[PDB]
Design a protein around this ligand. Structure first.
Ligand SMILES: NC(=O)[C@H]1CCCN(C(=O)Cc2cccc3cn[nH]c23)C1
Ligand SMILES: [Zn+2]
Length: 139
């Protein structure tokens, strides 16, 4: 579990979004596993605007932060789950690191701020949904 709070927005994994999230929907994209809802309080997270390929992510299944090298956002195949059929997830970045299904929502950060959130994983890999291209999160 976990979300990004920036301005009047909450960013969460689309497969974990609540009734409140959908009742206050701003934007959602099933192909990115992202959903953004509105909030009645200010968000003080800073979104990075960069092409960093190194950072640190929070891993709830280990109660620890891990440094990672990650790939550039791209279309990557993802197995069927209960939330989605087999498909290509776009704007996805992979890293070598530990992750388990309940790790989704853990933030990936670089020196510039928030990069994305855990969305996929398995086999010693962790996948992050990128948020650096969503320039509207700031205005
Ligand atoms: N974005 C999706 O379509 C996902 C929806 C939930 C299921 N899913 C996974 O990847 C499950 C999984 C296994 C093993 C480590 C991890 C870490 N996070 N998620 C992990 C696919
Ligand atoms: Zn950066």
């Amino acid at each position: 579990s976990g979300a990004i709070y920036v301005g009047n927005y909450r960013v969460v994994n689309r497969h974990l979004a609540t009734h409140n999230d959908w009742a206050n929907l701003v934007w959602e994209d099933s192909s990115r596993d992202l959903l953004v809802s509105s909030t009645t309080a200010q968000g003080c997270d800073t979104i990075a605007r960069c092409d960093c390929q190194t950072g640190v992510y929070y891993c709830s299944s280990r109660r620890k932060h891990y440094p990672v090298s990650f790939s550039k956002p791209s279309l990557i195949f993802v197995e069927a789950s209960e939330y989605y059929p087999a498909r290509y997830q776009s704007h996805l970045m992979l890293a070598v690191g530990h992750s388990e299904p309940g790790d989704c929502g853990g933030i990936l950060r670089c020196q510039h701020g928030v990069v994305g959130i855990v969305s996929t994983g398995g086999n010693g890999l962790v996948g992050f949904a990128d948020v650096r291209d969503l320039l509207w999160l700031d205005e």
